[PDB]
């Protein structure tokens, strides 16, 4: 039996909060007017370092350690870009019209033209939606773990779905704590989960773009990124 199902709602929140990865930095000599090769180089180097922290964050997601190694690999391979995107979108909440890739790397939609303007607008729209809903950090860590466990489970289960229900209880427990009525609790639950469908869409469109950069060979991609990218065919 697993340990995640015995945790109370507060124990689940604290475990997810404490597992949060750090906010990494981009390279410090900016030369802010970017080209396509330079902007993609900064983004690739940043995403490669974030992936290392994500893998260690995933081990600390309650219930994730109880899966086989093959199952952990499958979930991370399918969800890694979604998790990067919801992380980026969450950082960019307090910066409307900007994407906070790093504390020293704030980009607007004009910068996205050197390469992915449509994906920029989608990310900005998601951040503005989270800002309208006043998404709280306790809700964000629940959503990100839901993505980790949900995005690949249909491509293999009973343990994962039991853990997914556990996070659902945690989300509702967070909304009743904030004073929301019963009707407001399931309405907000639905709004948050429907945004995961758009995050999935952004990841699919984003993965298509990264497959082009590989065949374009514009920016050298790391072998780890090549293995994560190649897992989507």
């Amino acid at each position: 039996n697993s340990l995640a199902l015995s945790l109370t709602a507060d124990q689940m929140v604290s475990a997810l909060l404490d597992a949060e990865p750090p906010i990494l930095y981009s390279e410090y000599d900016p030369t802010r007017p970017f080209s396509e090769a330079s902007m993609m180089g900064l983004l690739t180097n940043l995403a490669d370092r974030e992936l290392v922290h994500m893998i260690n964050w995933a081990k600390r997601v309650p219930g994730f350690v109880d899966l086989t190694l093959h199952d952990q690999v499958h979930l991370l391979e399918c969800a890694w870009l979604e998790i990067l995107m919801i992380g980026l979108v969450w950082r960019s909440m307090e910066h409307p019209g900007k994407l906070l890739f790093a504390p020293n790397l704030l980009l607007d939609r004009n910068q996205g033209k050197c390469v992915m303007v449509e994906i920029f607008d989608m990310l900005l729209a998601t951040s503005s939606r989270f800002r309208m809903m006043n998404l709280q950090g306790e809700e964000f860590v629940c959503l990100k773990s839901i993505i980790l466990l949900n995005s690949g489970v249909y491509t293999f289960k009973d343990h994962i779905h039991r853990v997914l229900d556990k996070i659902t209880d945690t989300l509702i427990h967070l909304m009743a704590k904030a004073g929301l009525t019963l009707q407001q609790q399931h309405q907000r639950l639905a709004q948050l989960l429907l945004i995961l469908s758009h995050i999935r869409h952004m990841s699919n469109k984003g993965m298509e773009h990264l497959y082009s950069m590989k065949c374009k060979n514009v920016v050298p991609l790391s072998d780890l990124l090549l293995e994560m990218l190649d897992a989507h065919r």
């Binding site: 260690n56 995933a58 081990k59 190694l69 952990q72 690999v73 780890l224 293995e227």
Partner: peptide, 10 residues
């Protein structure tokens, strides 16, 4: 033979 395997076991 994946880098992901090593990072998950480290």
């Amino acid at each position: 033979h994946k880098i992901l395997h090593r990072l998950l076991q480290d």
